[PDB]
């Protein structure tokens, strides 16, 4: 048989190497009949390891933060046992190897939101540090934040920390305020949002980084020289994702959304929720004045969203079906929405050929319109910040708690 | 003193409770505060069961967390998460610190833990208030409910739905089919639903049990002699809860709903979602014929639900604002719903005193109608089972 090391409850074969984690090798192993990854730590890092561990313990469990099982000390080494995972997000993306990209980012973000709410800033969020679970008994996989080596629990009352309190991060993923010549403001929770923002693009672009190839990454970060050109400019899903990512990687940290703010963004909406947003908007503006601020804002830049005449950009059965009220102005955002609402509401009553083009409510119906009008949701989400304070629109927008 | 085994440590003075005639100490594991369960050689087979099954199912937030087992010369030790109290203390201890955990949410969490166990083919067999634990507060002062005590659990093999009634534990909360050899059907997952059903009634009645006081409980369960008399039959919230609980404690196991089905019941709906259900229903049936099977089902026994004429049982300002629509029939369930749909939609346009009588959307608005018409939801839910398969009605009903 091959070699096996046993240190109390922890056991592993040194041939079964899984990778590394900053610096210390990581082996596949066993603990309490659970499959676990096992990290061996040298004497010089004992002090650091214990501070990572305590922080992991003294911080509530969350499904998207990595489960810590046990540590066993030894005359030569220290041993940290955690959840065995299938891969890093890096390996997932690099190797192109069921699991939805958006759901992965959502789970990563919830893990981040959870840490921030415990006044923990991660400081080293990157594809290597986000682990992807083994499938559970029902086949389901999830993303999980790991590697708490640069973490900082900020004291109660503090909302920031010093740039120079440790290592700044991993070159390529470090927010500009950590390394810029002038420290105009101390870093806060928004360092992780910048990193997260870069991670998002990495996943969506299937391997690219907003600030370019590895060699010049950090220098471009300081210059603000990003390019999000893996995102199609006339594609709904990419338009939406560009809108979010741009804010997440903004040079001014105060302009970056909080982790909870990011989770409210249309990027993460189901198709049903998108359709429901369009309905609520339509209903809300049904008896609104064409010269009042809401419709002015909704029609500002509207010709481009509509593509001049929206009745020319739909399938023929719908063109035919929309010859009933000629009050639907083909160059109106309002009326386009108004028409969507009408054909969602009266869907059951519509001709069989018309229902065939649109597709079934809610998924295929909404995609019919978002596929054909790629700026419609992004434009409508922005304009209708005017009504964000209203009860109806509170699920779609983010507000700091009372 | 202080005892130490391997990684487990505890002071034997700090006793939290007792068990299989087993002791539970407050203690320590891997620098965590934990509960330490000490078990005798007699109950090692059932210590191995708990441990194995907690390792399979403790990822769920409402299942108790399992940390470590240490075997000894005389004893065995299981370290699990330390909890504040049991459900029994939460219900019966006077002026208990609820700490934001509402009854309905407690039961939703309990049931969600149960649905998790069932999806792993694990049947609990001993669910009762003593082993539904209330957590320690988290960093934001939130507490939660958790399932525990997995000694009597059972893992069924794949495509085994049923298990043999073995000779359990303590009486009071056990389904009839698990005790009486008189029953034709061997027990299944629905034994836990029965127990859950008694637990529901216990929580919302604030101490009472559908089959009576301790002495007569298990005898009443065999006889099928329940009483749900703490649920008032003309209060909305109690009519909804009664419909659910009657099904959960049914004498025929097959009639009891599964845990996922329970979680879909109106009992657990927000005020917003109840309103949304009324809106969807009204929209669904707007252009249905009055002689069709859906409206026929909706109007079957409708005069009682509407209190003969719903116009005579609403506030005066709403009466006036509805006189506009001449076609609304006072004896019609459909038109009551169409009236609710209409005024939700046109709410912001409505007159000041009509808005003021209805109350704000969605919560006060929906309660206006449910308070005055306590069978409306329960009736409409039952009736619109006809459209349960349709996509629109996916959030409201359960599809296997
Ligand atoms: N396929 C993989 N599965 C699991 N792990 C992997 C790793 C890894 O690095 N694992 C790992 C381990 Cl074994 C132990 C500690 C930490 N550090 S920690 O900060 O999470 N931490 C210390 C306080 C308690 C938690 C760690 F990140 C790297 C590559 C692949 C995998
Ligand atoms: Na976890
Ligand atoms: Na748990």
Query: DSSP characters for B293-306?
Result: HHHHHHTTTHHHHT
Closest chain A CA to residue B32 = A57
* Residue of B19, B77, B26, B17 lying closest to B47 (CA atoms): B77
Task: Give ∠ CA A361-A365-A371 in degrees, rounded to 5.
Answer: 155
Give me the residue label for tokens 């879909």: B264
Beta bridge partners of B123: B154
Q: What is the end-to-end Cα distance of chain A in Å, rounded?
A: 63
Strand partners, B23: B18, B38
B64 CA from centroid of ligand 3 (Å): 5
Would you call B7 and A70 a contact, using CB atoms and an 8 Å cutoff?
A: yes
Cα Dmax for chain A:
85
Categorise residue A56: left if φ over 0, alpha if ψ from -120 to 50, beta otherwise. alpha
Token digits for A368?
A: 């019919």
Q: How far is the CA of A199 from the centre of ligand 1 (A)?
A: 19
Q: Which of B41, B39, B34 is nearest to B11 (CA)?
A: B34
Q: Name the DSSP class of B105.
A: H
Cα separation, A113 vs A107, in Å, equals 10
**For residues A121 and A161, is the Cβ–Cβ distance under 8 A?**
yes
What separation in angstroms does the CA of A160 have from each of A124, A175, A285, A286? 16, 14, 42, 46
Q: How would you classify residue A401: left for phi > 0, otherwise alpha for psi between -120 and 50, otherwise beta?
A: beta
CA dist B211 and B220 (Å) reads 6
Alpha carbon distance, N-terminus to C-terminus of chain B? 55
Burial class (CB in 10 A: 0-12, 13-18, 19+), A1: exposed
Q: Please, which residues have CB within 8 angstroms of residue B166's CB and are 6 or more apart in sequence?
A: none
What 3-state DSSP class applies to B27? strand
Characterise A342 by phi-psi region: left (phi > 0), alpha (psi -120 to 50), beta (else): alpha
Tokens of A189: 């929770």
Q: Is A138 annotated as a binding residue?
A: no
Give B264's DSSP letter: T
**Six token digits for residue B309:** 């004429």
Which of A148, A116, A120, A115 lies closest to A22 in space, CA to CA? A148
CA distance B125 to B110: 14
CA-nearest residue to B141 within chain A is A60
At B119, list the tokens. Answer: 């999806």
Nearest-CA residue for atom 19 of ligand 1: A147
What are the structure tokens assigned to A145, written together?
Answer: 């934040």
Q: Does A327 touch chain B (CB under 8 A)?
A: no
Phi first, then psi: what are they for A155, rounded to 5°? -60, 160
Q: In what order do the strands lie in the sheet with B145-147?
A: B83-86, B132-135, B145-147
Nearest CA to ligand 1 atom 18: A147
Judged on CB neighbours under 10 Å (0-12, 13-18, 19+), B110 is buried
> By the 8 A CB rule, do B354 and B321 touch?
yes
Parallel, antiparallel or unpaired: strands B145-147 and B132-135? antiparallel
Residues of B in contact with A34 (CB under 8 A): 55
Q: How many residues does chain A have?
A: 402
A130 touches ligand 1 (CB under 6 Å): no
Ligand 1 contact via A124 beta carbon (within 6 Å): no
Counting other chains too, the contacts that A306-315 makes at CB distance below 8 Å and 24 or more residues apart are: A306/A330, A306/A331, A306/A332, A306/A333, A306/A336, A306/A373, A307/A373, A310/A336, A310/A373, A313/A372, A313/A373, A314/A372, A315/A357
Is residue A35 among the annotated active site residues? Answer: no
Number of CB atoms found within 10 A of residue B13's CB: 9
Contact B330, B309 (CB under 8 A): yes
CA nearest neighbour of B30 among A113, A130, A127, A9: A9
Ligand 2 centre to CA of A128 (Å) is 18
Whole-angstrom CA distances from B252 to A325, A366, B159, B265 are: 57, 44, 22, 19
> Hey, where are the domains in chain A?
1-83, 84-270, 271-402
| B contact residues 107-126, partner A, Cβ 8 Å cutoff | 119-120
Sheet holding B32-39, edge to edge: B3-4, B8-18, B23-29, B32-39, B76-81, B66-71
Question: Is A402 exposed, middle or buried (CB count within 10 Å of its CB: 0-12, 13-18, 19+)?
Answer: exposed
Angstrom distance (rounded) from CA B331 to CA A186: 68
Q: Phi then psi for A103, rounded to 5 degrees?
A: -60, -35
* Cβ separation B283–A57 shorter than 8 A: no
Atom of ligand 1 nearest to the CA of A66: 20
- CB-based contact, B136 to chain A, within 8 Å: no
Ligand closest to the CA atom of residue A145: 1
Contact at 8 Å (CB) between B257 and B396? no
Q: What is the DSSP string of B222-263?
A: HHT----TTS-TTSHHHHHHHHHHHHHT-SSGGGSPPHHHHH
- Which of A18, A59, A132 to mutate for ligand 1's pocket (most ligand atoms within 8 Å of CB)? A18
Handedness of CA A36, A40, A43, A45 (dihedral sign): negative
CA dist A351 and A317 (Å) reads 9
């Amino acid at each position: 048989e091959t070699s096996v090391v046993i240190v109390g409850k922890i056991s592993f074969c040194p041939k079964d190497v899984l990778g590394h984690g900053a610096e210390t090798i990581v082996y596949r192993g066993m603990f309490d009949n659970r499959d676990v990854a096992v990290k061996r730590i040298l004497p010089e890092c004992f002090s650091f390891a214990d501070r990572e561990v305590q922080l992991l313990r003294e911080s509530d469990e969350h499904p998207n933060v990595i489960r810590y099982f046990c540590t066993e000390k030894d005359r030569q080494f220290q041993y940290i046992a955690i959840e065995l995972c299938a891969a890093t997000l890096q390996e997932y993306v690099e190797q192109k190897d069921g699991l939805e990209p958006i759901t992965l980012l959502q789970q990563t973000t919830s893990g981040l939101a959870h840490l921030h709410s415990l006044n923990i800033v991660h400081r080293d969020l990157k594809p290597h540090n986000i682990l992807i679970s083994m499938p559970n008994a029902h086949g389901k996989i999830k993303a999980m934040i790991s590697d708490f080596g640069l973490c900082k629990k900020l004291a109660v009352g503090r909302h920031s920390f010093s740039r120079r309190s440790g290592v700044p991060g991993t070159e390529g993923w470090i927010a500009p305020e950590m390394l810029s010549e002038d420290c105009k403001e101390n870093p806060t929770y928004t360092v992780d949002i910048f990193s997260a923002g870069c991670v998002f693009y990495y996943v969506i672009s299937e391997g690219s980084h907003p600030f370019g190839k590895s060699l010049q990454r950090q220098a471009n970060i300081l210059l603000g020289a990003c390019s999000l050109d893996c995102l199609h400019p006339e594609k709904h899903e990419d338009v939406i994702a560009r809108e979010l990512i741009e804010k997440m990687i903004a040079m001014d940290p105060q302009k970056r959304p909080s982790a909870k703010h990011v989770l409210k963004h249309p990027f993460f909406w189901s198709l049903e929720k998108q359709l429901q947003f369009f309905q609520d908007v339509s209903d809300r503006i049904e008896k609104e004045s064409l010269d009042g601020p809401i419709v002015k804002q909704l029609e500002r830049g509207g010709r481009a969203v509509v593509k001049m005449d929206w009745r020319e950009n739909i399938t023929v059965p719908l063109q035919t079906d929309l010859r009933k009220f000629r009050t639907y102005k083909g160059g109106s955002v309002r009326d386009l929405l108004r028409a969507m609402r009408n054909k969602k509401h009266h869907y059951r009553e519509l001709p069989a050929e018309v229902r065939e083009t649109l597709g079934s409510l809610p998924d295929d119906f909404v995609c019919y319109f978002t596929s054909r009008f790629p700026h419609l949701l992004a434009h409508t989400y922005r304009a209708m910040e005017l009504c964000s304070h209203e009860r109806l629109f509170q699920p779609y927008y983010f507000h700091e708690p009372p």
